Scaffold this motif. Structure first.
Motif, short mmCIF file in Angstrom:
data_model
loop_
_atom_site.label_atom_id
_atom_site.label_comp_id
_atom_site.label_asym_id
_atom_site.label_seq_id
_atom_site.Cartn_x
_atom_site.Cartn_y
_atom_site.Cartn_z
N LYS A 1 0.85 -1.20 0.00
CA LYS A 1 0.00 0.00 0.00
C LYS A 1 0.87 1.23 0.00
CE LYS A 1 -4.09 -1.74 0.27
NZ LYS A 1 -5.25 -1.37 -0.52
N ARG A 2 0.34 2.37 -0.43
CA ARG A 2 1.14 3.59 -0.55
C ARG A 2 0.35 4.79 -0.10
NH1 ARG A 2 0.11 2.59 -6.10
NH2 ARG A 2 2.24 1.70 -6.34
N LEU A 3 1.03 5.71 0.57
CA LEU A 3 0.48 7.03 0.86
C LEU A 3 1.44 8.00 0.18
CD1 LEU A 3 -0.60 8.62 4.28
CD2 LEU A 3 -0.97 9.28 1.90
N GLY A 4 0.97 8.68 -0.85
CA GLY A 4 1.81 9.49 -1.69
C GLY A 4 3.06 8.81 -2.20
N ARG A 5 4.20 9.42 -1.88
CA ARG A 5 5.52 9.02 -2.36
C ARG A 5 5.91 7.67 -1.82
NH1 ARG A 5 9.97 11.89 -1.53
NH2 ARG A 5 10.68 9.70 -1.82
N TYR A 6 5.27 7.29 -0.72
CA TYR A 6 5.76 6.25 0.17
C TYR A 6 5.09 4.88 0.04
CZ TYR A 6 7.39 10.66 1.83
OH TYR A 6 7.95 11.93 1.91
N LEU A 7 5.87 3.97 -0.55
CA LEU A 7 5.49 2.59 -0.74
C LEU A 7 5.75 1.75 0.51
CD1 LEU A 7 7.03 1.76 -4.24
CD2 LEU A 7 4.62 1.39 -3.76
N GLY A 8 4.76 0.98 0.90
CA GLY A 8 4.91 0.16 2.07
C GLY A 8 4.07 -1.08 2.03
N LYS A 9 3.96 -1.71 3.18
CA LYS A 9 3.36 -3.01 3.24
C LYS A 9 2.64 -3.08 4.54
CE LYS A 9 4.35 -7.71 3.67
NZ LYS A 9 4.53 -7.53 5.17
N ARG A 10 1.50 -3.75 4.54
CA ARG A 10 0.81 -4.03 5.77
C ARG A 10 1.36 -5.27 6.45
NH1 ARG A 10 -4.97 -2.92 3.77
NH2 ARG A 10 -5.20 -0.64 4.06
N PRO A 11 1.06 -5.45 7.74
CA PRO A 11 1.68 -6.64 8.33
C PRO A 11 1.17 -7.98 7.84
CG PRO A 11 0.46 -5.36 9.91
CD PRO A 11 0.64 -4.50 8.76
N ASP A 12 2.08 -8.93 7.86
CA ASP A 12 1.74 -10.29 7.51
C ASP A 12 0.94 -10.89 8.66
OD1 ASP A 12 2.75 -10.06 5.09
OD2 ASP A 12 4.73 -10.85 5.55
N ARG A 13 0.00 -11.77 8.34
CA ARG A 13 -0.94 -12.29 9.34
C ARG A 13 -1.17 -13.73 9.13
NH1 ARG A 13 -3.63 -7.97 7.31
NH2 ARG A 13 -5.65 -9.01 6.90
N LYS A 14 -1.62 -14.42 10.16
CA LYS A 14 -1.96 -15.81 10.00
C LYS A 14 -3.37 -15.98 10.48
CE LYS A 14 0.04 -20.12 11.33
NZ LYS A 14 1.41 -20.51 11.76
N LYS A 15 -4.18 -16.74 9.75
CA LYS A 15 -5.47 -16.95 10.31
C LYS A 15 -5.71 -18.40 10.53
CE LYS A 15 -8.30 -16.08 6.26
NZ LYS A 15 -8.97 -15.03 5.47
N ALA A 16 -6.50 -18.70 11.55
CA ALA A 16 -6.69 -20.07 11.98
C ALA A 16 -8.16 -20.34 12.01
CB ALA A 16 -6.11 -20.26 13.37
N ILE A 17 -8.56 -21.54 11.62
CA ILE A 17 -9.94 -21.95 11.63
C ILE A 17 -10.13 -23.20 12.43
CG2 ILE A 17 -11.91 -22.70 10.27
CD1 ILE A 17 -10.28 -21.17 7.97
N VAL A 18 -10.59 -23.04 13.66
CA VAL A 18 -10.75 -24.15 14.59
C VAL A 18 -12.14 -24.71 14.47
CG1 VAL A 18 -9.24 -22.86 16.09
CG2 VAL A 18 -11.66 -22.87 16.50
#
Ligand SMILES: [Mg+2]
Ligand SMILES: [Mg+2]
Ligand SMILES: [Mg+2]
Ligand SMILES: [Mg+2]
Ligand SMILES: [Mg+2]
Ligand SMILES: [Mg+2]
Ligand SMILES: [Mg+2]
Ligand SMILES: [Mg+2]
Ligand SMILES: [Mg+2]
Ligand SMILES: [Mg+2]
Ligand SMILES: [Mg+2]
Ligand SMILES: [Mg+2]
Ligand SMILES: [Mg+2]
Ligand SMILES: [Mg+2]
Ligand SMILES: [Mg+2]
Ligand SMILES: [Mg+2]
Ligand SMILES: [Mg+2]
Ligand SMILES: [Mg+2]
Ligand SMILES: [Mg+2]
Ligand SMILES: [Mg+2]
Ligand SMILES: [Mg+2]
Ligand SMILES: [Mg+2]
Ligand SMILES: [Mg+2]
Ligand SMILES: [Mg+2]
Ligand SMILES: [Mg+2]
Ligand SMILES: [Mg+2]
Ligand SMILES: [Mg+2]
Ligand SMILES: [Mg+2]
Ligand SMILES: [Mg+2]
Ligand SMILES: [Mg+2]
Ligand SMILES: [Mg+2]
Ligand SMILES: [Mg+2]
Ligand SMILES: [Mg+2]
Ligand SMILES: [Mg+2]
Ligand SMILES: [Mg+2]
Ligand SMILES: [Mg+2]
Ligand SMILES: [Mg+2]
Ligand SMILES: [Mg+2]
Ligand SMILES: [Mg+2]
Ligand SMILES: [Mg+2]
Ligand SMILES: [Mg+2]
Ligand SMILES: [Mg+2]
Ligand SMILES: [Mg+2]
Ligand SMILES: [Mg+2]
Ligand SMILES: [Mg+2]
Ligand SMILES: [Mg+2]
Ligand SMILES: [Mg+2]
Ligand SMILES: [Mg+2]
Ligand SMILES: [Mg+2]
Ligand SMILES: [Mg+2]
Ligand SMILES: [Mg+2]
Ligand SMILES: [Mg+2]
Ligand SMILES: [Mg+2]
Ligand SMILES: [Mg+2]
Ligand SMILES: [Mg+2]
Ligand SMILES: [Mg+2]
Ligand SMILES: [Mg+2]
Ligand SMILES: [Mg+2]
Ligand SMILES: [Mg+2]
Ligand SMILES: [Mg+2]
Ligand SMILES: [Mg+2]
Ligand SMILES: [Mg+2]
Ligand SMILES: [Mg+2]
Ligand SMILES: [Mg+2]
Ligand SMILES: [Mg+2]
Ligand SMILES: [Mg+2]
Ligand SMILES: [Mg+2]
Ligand SMILES: [Mg+2]
Ligand SMILES: [Mg+2]
Ligand SMILES: [Mg+2]
Ligand SMILES: [Mg+2]
Ligand SMILES: [Mg+2]
Ligand SMILES: [Mg+2]
Ligand SMILES: [Mg+2]
Ligand SMILES: [Mg+2]
Ligand SMILES: [Mg+2]
Ligand SMILES: [Mg+2]
Ligand SMILES: [Mg+2]
Ligand SMILES: [Mg+2]
Ligand SMILES: [Mg+2]
Ligand SMILES: [Mg+2]
Ligand SMILES: [Mg+2]
Ligand SMILES: [Mg+2]
Ligand SMILES: [Mg+2]
Ligand SMILES: [Mg+2]
Ligand SMILES: [Mg+2]
Ligand SMILES: [Mg+2]
Ligand SMILES: [Mg+2]
Ligand SMILES: [Mg+2]
Ligand SMILES: [Mg+2]
Ligand SMILES: [Mg+2]
Ligand SMILES: [Mg+2]
Ligand SMILES: [Mg+2]
Ligand SMILES: [Mg+2]
Ligand SMILES: [Mg+2]
Ligand SMILES: [Mg+2]
Ligand SMILES: [Mg+2]
Ligand SMILES: [Mg+2]
Ligand SMILES: [Mg+2]
Ligand SMILES: [Mg+2]
Ligand SMILES: [Mg+2]
Ligand SMILES: [Mg+2]
Ligand SMILES: [Mg+2]
Ligand SMILES: [Mg+2]
Ligand SMILES: [Mg+2]
Ligand SMILES: [Mg+2]
Ligand SMILES: [Mg+2]
Ligand SMILES: [Mg+2]
Ligand SMILES: [Mg+2]
Ligand SMILES: [Mg+2]
Ligand SMILES: [Mg+2]
Ligand SMILES: [Mg+2]
Ligand SMILES: [Mg+2]
Ligand SMILES: [Mg+2]
Ligand SMILES: [Mg+2]
Ligand SMILES: [Mg+2]
Ligand SMILES: [Mg+2]
Ligand SMILES: [Mg+2]
Ligand SMILES: [Mg+2]
Ligand SMILES: [Mg+2]
Ligand SMILES: [Mg+2]
Ligand SMILES: [Mg+2]
Ligand SMILES: [Mg+2]
Ligand SMILES: [Mg+2]
Ligand SMILES: [Mg+2]
Ligand SMILES: [Mg+2]
Ligand SMILES: [Mg+2]
Ligand SMILES: [Mg+2]
Ligand SMILES: [Mg+2]
Ligand SMILES: [Mg+2]
Ligand SMILES: [Mg+2]
Ligand SMILES: [Mg+2]
Ligand SMILES: [Mg+2]
Ligand SMILES: [Mg+2]
Ligand SMILES: [Mg+2]
Ligand SMILES: [Mg+2]
Ligand SMILES: [Mg+2]
Ligand SMILES: [Mg+2]
Ligand SMILES: [Mg+2]
Ligand SMILES: [Mg+2]
Ligand SMILES: [Mg+2]
Ligand SMILES: [Mg+2]
Ligand SMILES: [Mg+2]
Ligand SMILES: [Mg+2]
Ligand SMILES: [Mg+2]
Ligand SMILES: [Mg+2]
Ligand SMILES: [Mg+2]
Ligand SMILES: [Mg+2]
Ligand SMILES: [Mg+2]
Ligand SMILES: [Mg+2]
Ligand SMILES: [Mg+2]
Ligand SMILES: [Mg+2]
Ligand SMILES: [Mg+2]
Ligand SMILES: [Mg+2]
Ligand SMILES: [Mg+2]
Ligand SMILES: [Mg+2]
Ligand SMILES: [Mg+2]
Ligand SMILES: [Mg+2]
Ligand SMILES: [Mg+2]
Ligand SMILES: [Mg+2]
Ligand SMILES: [Mg+2]
Ligand SMILES: [Mg+2]
Ligand SMILES: [Mg+2]
Ligand SMILES: [Mg+2]
Ligand SMILES: [Mg+2]
Ligand SMILES: [Mg+2]
Ligand SMILES: [Mg+2]
Ligand SMILES: [Mg+2]
Ligand SMILES: [Mg+2]
Ligand SMILES: [Mg+2]
Ligand SMILES: [Mg+2]
Ligand SMILES: [Mg+2]
Ligand SMILES: [Mg+2]
Ligand SMILES: [Mg+2]
Ligand SMILES: [Mg+2]
Ligand SMILES: [Mg+2]
Ligand SMILES: [Mg+2]
Ligand SMILES: [Mg+2]
Ligand SMILES: [Mg+2]
Ligand SMILES: [Mg+2]
Ligand SMILES: [Mg+2]
Ligand SMILES: [Mg+2]
Ligand SMILES: [Mg+2]
Ligand SMILES: [Mg+2]
Ligand SMILES: [Mg+2]
Ligand SMILES: [Mg+2]
Ligand SMILES: [Mg+2]
Ligand SMILES: [Mg+2]
Ligand SMILES: [Mg+2]
Ligand SMILES: [Mg+2]
Ligand SMILES: [Mg+2]
Ligand SMILES: [Mg+2]
Ligand SMILES: [Mg+2]
Ligand SMILES: [Mg+2]
Ligand SMILES: [Mg+2]
Ligand SMILES: [Mg+2]
Ligand SMILES: [Mg+2]
Ligand SMILES: [Zn+2]
Lengths: 95, 107, 97, 70
Positions: free
Chosen positions: A64-81
């Motif tokens: 994802k980016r806000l103006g000039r600035y390219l970045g990344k959201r956090p990596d996540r794990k999901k679990a289905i019990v």
RNA sequence: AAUCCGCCUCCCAACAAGCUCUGCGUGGUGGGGAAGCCCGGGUGACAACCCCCCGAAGCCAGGGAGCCAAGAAAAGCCUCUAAGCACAACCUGCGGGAACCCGUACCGCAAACCGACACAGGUGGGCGGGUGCAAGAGCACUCAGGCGCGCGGGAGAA
RNA sequence: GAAUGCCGGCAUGAGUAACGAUAAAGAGGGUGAGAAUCCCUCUCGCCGUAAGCCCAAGGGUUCCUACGCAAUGGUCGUCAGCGUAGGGUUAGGCGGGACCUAAGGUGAAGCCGAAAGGCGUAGCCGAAGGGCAGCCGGUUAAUAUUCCGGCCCUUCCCGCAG
RNA sequence: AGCCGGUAGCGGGCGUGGAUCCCUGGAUGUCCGAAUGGGGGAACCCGGCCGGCGGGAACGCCGGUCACCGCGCGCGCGGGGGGAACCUGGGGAACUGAAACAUCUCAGUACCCAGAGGAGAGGAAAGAGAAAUCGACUCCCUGAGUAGCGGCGAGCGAAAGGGGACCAGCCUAAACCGUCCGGCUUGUCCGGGCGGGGUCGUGGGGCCCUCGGACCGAAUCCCCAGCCUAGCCGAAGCUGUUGGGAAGCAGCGCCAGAGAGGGUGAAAGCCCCGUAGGCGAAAGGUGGGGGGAUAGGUGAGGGUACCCGAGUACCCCGUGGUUCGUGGAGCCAUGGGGGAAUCUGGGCGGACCACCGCCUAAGGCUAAGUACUCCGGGUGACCGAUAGCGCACCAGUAC
């Protein structure tokens, strides 16, 4: 110190996760390093239930980016019990 | 380590320079990062506001504009004159601001 | 080609100087150098095998210090050496230097 | 949290035993999860509570560590 | 070390049988199920689900023959025994419990990969239907499926 | 003021060449401020040992949905592999790991070299080779041999029996 | 006295019961990295042993622990990797210059490597070299572009002495004495460890006689001043006027150990921040200065001839270092061969010899004066966005 409450971060809020409640499948965001066995235990001590099956998958952060600035959201794990026949996790039934 | 402020919310200040030279008022707010104060009813500006829930009917509001802190002088609560500040050490000895014209505390 | 376990003698670098011509001392015009290039001079290393404490110890040593190994054996009689490994014996021996 | 309540937390914590500190942290970690869940469905207007709890847990763990450190 | 394997001898069996493993068929059961017609879905439908032919390069497989250029290793697995141990252990059958981590979207002969480009180039493996042409993965047409290639409209000189 | 100087800006050629395979289009209907170019219908053409479908590399969210059209798209754009946001990848049996070894690499022992380092039977690493237990169908906008359903199976732990 | 970083907003809180913020110390500190349980395509994967969690045996998680090498008796201690320049050591070019080129130069430079450290190296004469002399080493000035070296070309280039900076000297080996331990070839043995003794060039020490019987003092340790890592006090201006704004102009004042400088609506000693002059640390760091302790230090004749650093000196061969390029070529160093002595010993003063002198090799350490600038501060007849660092800006980034 590590407790079950460090392993389960938040419930997953989406039409797909809700569709699982009917048959006893609860979907949580969990800590990305957490094992099926450990999540089995964490869920059982947090929601007083009996976990019978655990599915896990990794979820990559979106770029994802806000103006000039390219970045990344956090990596996540999901679990289905899957809880034991007849049991229920009321905090989630919710909705 | 900290910006130095000779004035504070909300002692009473003379505005000693600018369009409002001569006014007296309470300091509503101190803004150390900008080195500025808001003085009550001084430096009024007209600001446009959009027709919004916050402001239905829209139009304009009046806002108080910050002043450079150096434009402002505390009025001594003892003798009533605008003054420079001195510090004085008490017997505690906490230190306090005191009028420099007479000797009174300024708080 | 390498290092004397006893003296520390090590390969050194030397020039090899090539000359042509008649020396002045012999009435000649003089020597002219027709070449200088680097080379190495090695220690005269050889193997010396010795039984000490029922073990076979061997040294890689400059020929000049061959007697120094045997002298080490002599000085070794005063030591509890039996049952140690040959690596360990050699250490005790060298330590005597 | 109010400064006076912080002092109060430290005094009360410092009187506790390691085991009692562990029980109490575990309960607070639980209480945080409840808070997290509420934040995620939009029902936690009082969101300063999350920063707070996280620091109580720190303070407690900090003290637990004091206790075990010697 | 060995009761195993090798070697010698004897007896019985030997293009068999037996035992064993796999392929295919059947098989309790579970599914799917067209055109067309209505608005991906409904109906068709209680769908039918049968016979004959062709037939692999795939399978049985570690099959067979011939040839010279003479065609991996190691574990799994079986067997043998050694320290040991023989209330153990291992094998077989049954029962209950336990079963972790990473990948999985999407492009993938290409506008998403390599070529500075939504580039007529380059990119390994599998499937690749029908008819006819002697054959075929050739050629033509065509199924399923996919496309008309990200400027167009006219005009009808050199 | 010149160094085919250096950096930048802006001209000229010029409304010119070109707009990237000669497989090809036409119409009606819809939507929208705007439509040859987006959606739907019918007609037409092209590929069909492919220009269809499935895998592996490589790529890395490009997937699905909603809202958009400044720029990107050789035109246009209401559309898009583009902008914003939200969703989406589920395994004991598929693939790889907790198995094996190949070349090669590394390397107890050991050997060698001014230093750095170079070798080296064992061992270890190393696979698209060996070994190992899952088939059919249903379901989502978007995953499915992974979820569901049906019928099957593997190892490990414990126990009982022989 | 405000605050919840750049950073506003939504939505919520904190602070004179002292928040935010600054400094010091501590706690926590996923994974990778020397990376060190093992593996590996860094940031992933897989284990052993002890303890814990779950219903827990399989499974998983949590805490602790497990690499290799060196040194010392399985256990202890240490090592490993990094650092902009600086430094030492081991290796070590070429362009170029010589108006060609080979010796020579460039240059023991660039560069690779190892190692050190806040510096490093060197250092207490087997020195210098002519003075009847000096007196460790380092570093600056000078001596001097001298002496010399040199296809006597191109070029290269000392040292003594003099002026300065700093200043400081120590520990061993051996003789001999004692002790423990080991050996077989049994003691007047040989050998290893430890302690004692000893440390020098007027030679010194050992041992055997004679005579004699408290001062110095660390480079180690301890305390302290001082210093650093946050800070704090700090003189004196009002009014009018033009102006959006006064600090401009005008009137009348005041401070000054402060008229450096920067801000404030323009041009301000007196408005703000400062400036002169002062003040300041519970904690950590420093502490070369002050004080204290401790280690350690200290005699004279006479005799004896025991000791005074070995594959060493010394000679020869091959080389390097020096100003020295084979030269009349010594000196220092050493790869090869040969190979001593213990002061009546040895090395040196430029082949060699004599004489006359100087000095004590083959063990080790040693502050300071010196180099550098990643870091902090101060200051510019330094730049001012094509400049100045490659970067004033999210740059070693986009690409
Ligand atoms: Mg923790
Ligand atoms: Mg759904
Ligand atoms: Mg657990
Ligand atoms: Mg998975
Ligand atoms: Mg983020
Ligand atoms: Mg202050
Ligand atoms: Mg006034
Ligand atoms: Mg105070
Ligand atoms: Mg020669
Ligand atoms: Mg001659
Ligand atoms: Mg002559
Ligand atoms: Mg010559
Ligand atoms: Mg020999
Ligand atoms: Mg020799
Ligand atoms: Mg010899
Ligand atoms: Mg045998
Ligand atoms: Mg069958
Ligand atoms: Mg069957
Ligand atoms: Mg149907
Ligand atoms: Mg139909
Ligand atoms: Mg029906
Ligand atoms: Mg019907
Ligand atoms: Mg065959
Ligand atoms: Mg093999
Ligand atoms: Mg093996
Ligand atoms: Mg036995
Ligand atoms: Mg059996
Ligand atoms: Mg079973
Ligand atoms: Mg595991
Ligand atoms: Mg996974
Ligand atoms: Mg992939
Ligand atoms: Mg998938
Ligand atoms: Mg897929
Ligand atoms: Mg495509
Ligand atoms: Mg596809
Ligand atoms: Mg092609
Ligand atoms: Mg292909
Ligand atoms: Mg395709
Ligand atoms: Mg491309
Ligand atoms: Mg492209
Ligand atoms: Mg195109
Ligand atoms: Mg192409
Ligand atoms: Mg091809
Ligand atoms: Mg045919
Ligand atoms: Mg034909
Ligand atoms: Mg034909
Ligand atoms: Mg055909
Ligand atoms: Mg064809
Ligand atoms: Mg079609
Ligand atoms: Mg076309
Ligand atoms: Mg025309
Ligand atoms: Mg000119
Ligand atoms: Mg030109
Ligand atoms: Mg040009
Ligand atoms: Mg130019
Ligand atoms: Mg120009
Ligand atoms: Mg240019
Ligand atoms: Mg230009
Ligand atoms: Mg133009
Ligand atoms: Mg025209
Ligand atoms: Mg033209
Ligand atoms: Mg034309
Ligand atoms: Mg043209
Ligand atoms: Mg073109
Ligand atoms: Mg044209
Ligand atoms: Mg085109
Ligand atoms: Mg075209
Ligand atoms: Mg054509
Ligand atoms: Mg149309
Ligand atoms: Mg129309
Ligand atoms: Mg259009
Ligand atoms: Mg349009
Ligand atoms: Mg078109
Ligand atoms: Mg359409
Ligand atoms: Mg065709
Ligand atoms: Mg066909
Ligand atoms: Mg790419
Ligand atoms: Mg994107
Ligand atoms: Mg998809
Ligand atoms: Mg998308
Ligand atoms: Mg899409
Ligand atoms: Mg849309
Ligand atoms: Mg656009
Ligand atoms: Mg447009
Ligand atoms: Mg437009
Ligand atoms: Mg926009
Ligand atoms: Mg464009
Ligand atoms: Mg366009
Ligand atoms: Mg284009
Ligand atoms: Mg629109
Ligand atoms: Mg697109
Ligand atoms: Mg998009
Ligand atoms: Mg399954
Ligand atoms: Mg396991
Ligand atoms: Mg493996
Ligand atoms: Mg292996
Ligand atoms: Mg190797
Ligand atoms: Mg090998
Ligand atoms: Mg293995
Ligand atoms: Mg494999
Ligand atoms: Mg395989
Ligand atoms: Mg497997
Ligand atoms: Mg498998
Ligand atoms: Mg199956
Ligand atoms: Mg799909
Ligand atoms: Mg899906
Ligand atoms: Mg299933
Ligand atoms: Mg039994
Ligand atoms: Mg913020
Ligand atoms: Mg608010
Ligand atoms: Mg607020
Ligand atoms: Mg305080
Ligand atoms: Mg700190
Ligand atoms: Mg963690
Ligand atoms: Mg680590
Ligand atoms: Mg490791
Ligand atoms: Mg390793
Ligand atoms: Mg462990
Ligand atoms: Mg355990
Ligand atoms: Mg449970
Ligand atoms: Mg357990
Ligand atoms: Mg652990
Ligand atoms: Mg090192
Ligand atoms: Mg280091
Ligand atoms: Mg050197
Ligand atoms: Mg070396
Ligand atoms: Mg060298
Ligand atoms: Mg070379
Ligand atoms: Mg040259
Ligand atoms: Mg040059
Ligand atoms: Mg020249
Ligand atoms: Mg030349
Ligand atoms: Mg020339
Ligand atoms: Mg030439
Ligand atoms: Mg030359
Ligand atoms: Mg030059
Ligand atoms: Mg040179
Ligand atoms: Mg060097
Ligand atoms: Mg350099
Ligand atoms: Mg280093
Ligand atoms: Mg210094
Ligand atoms: Mg030093
Ligand atoms: Mg030193
Ligand atoms: Mg000395
Ligand atoms: Mg002169
Ligand atoms: Mg030179
Ligand atoms: Mg000389
Ligand atoms: Mg001098
Ligand atoms: Mg001097
Ligand atoms: Mg000085
Ligand atoms: Mg002895
Ligand atoms: Mg003795
Ligand atoms: Mg002794
Ligand atoms: Mg004497
Ligand atoms: Mg000392
Ligand atoms: Mg002040
Ligand atoms: Mg002042
Ligand atoms: Mg006025
Ligand atoms: Mg005024
Ligand atoms: Mg005046
Ligand atoms: Mg001054
Ligand atoms: Mg000034
Ligand atoms: Mg100023
Ligand atoms: Mg002025
Ligand atoms: Mg001025
Ligand atoms: Mg001023
Ligand atoms: Mg001062
Ligand atoms: Mg001061
Ligand atoms: Mg005497
Ligand atoms: Mg003697
Ligand atoms: Mg001596
Ligand atoms: Mg010696
Ligand atoms: Mg010589
Ligand atoms: Mg030379
Ligand atoms: Mg000469
Ligand atoms: Mg010479
Ligand atoms: Mg020699
Ligand atoms: Mg003499
Ligand atoms: Mg002599
Ligand atoms: Mg000599
Ligand atoms: Mg000599
Ligand atoms: Mg001489
Ligand atoms: Mg001399
Ligand atoms: Mg001398
Ligand atoms: Mg030294
Ligand atoms: Mg000193
Ligand atoms: Mg120094
Ligand atoms: Mg300096
Ligand atoms: Mg600086
Ligand atoms: Mg300037
Ligand atoms: Mg600029
Ligand atoms: Mg610049
Ligand atoms: Mg400018
Ligand atoms: Mg900079
Ligand atoms: Mg630049
Ligand atoms: Mg720039
Ligand atoms: Mg950038
Ligand atoms: Zn007053």
């Amino acid at each position: 110190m590590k407790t079950a409450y460090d392993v389960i971060l938040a419930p997953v809020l989406s039409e797909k996760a809700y569709a699982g409640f009917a048959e006893g499948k609860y979907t949580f965001w969990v800590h990305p390093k957490a094992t099926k066995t450990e999540i089995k235990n964490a869920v059982e001590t947090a929601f007083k239930v009996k976990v019978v099956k655990v599915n896990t998958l990794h979820v990559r952060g979106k770029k994802k980016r806000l103006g000039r600035y390219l970045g990344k959201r956090p990596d996540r794990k999901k679990a289905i019990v899957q809880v034991a026949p007849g049991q229920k996790i009321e905090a989630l039934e919710g909705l | 380590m900290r910006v130095k402020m000779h004035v504070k919310k909300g002692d009473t200040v003379l505005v000693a320079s600018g369009k409002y030279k001569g006014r007296v008022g309470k300091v509503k707010e101190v803004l150390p990062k900008k080195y500025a104060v808001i003085v009550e009813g001084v430096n009024i500006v007209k600001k446009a506001v959009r027709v919004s829930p916050k402001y239905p009917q829209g139009g304009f509001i009046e806002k108080e504009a910050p002043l450079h802190a150096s434009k402002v002088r505390p009025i001594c609560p003892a003798c009533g004159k605008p003054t420079r500040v001195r510090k004085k050490f008490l017997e505690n000895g906490k230190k306090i601001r005191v009028c420099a014209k007479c000797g009174g505390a300024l708080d | 080609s390498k290092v004397c376990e006893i003296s520390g003698k090590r390969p050194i670098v030397a020039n090899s100087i090539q000359r042509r011509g008649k020396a002045k001392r012999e009435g000649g015009v003089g020597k002219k150098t027709t070449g200088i290039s680097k080379r190495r001079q090695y220690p005269n290393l050889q193997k010396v095998r010795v039984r000490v404490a029922g073990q076979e110890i061997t040294f890689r040593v400059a020929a000049s210090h061959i007697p120094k190994v045997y002298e080490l054996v002599e000085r070794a009689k005063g030591l509890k050496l039996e049952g140690l490994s040959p690596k360990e014996i050699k250490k005790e021996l060298l330590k005597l230097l | 949290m109010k400064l006076s309540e912080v002092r109060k937390q430290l005094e009360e914590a410092r009187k506790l035993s390691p085991v009692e500190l562990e029980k109490l942290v575990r309960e607070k970690k639980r209480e945080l999860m409840e808070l997290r869940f509420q934040a995620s469905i939009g029902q936690l207007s009082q969101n300063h509570k999350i920063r707070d709890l996280k620091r109580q847990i720190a303070r407690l763990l900090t003290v637990l560590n004091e206790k075990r450190r010697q």
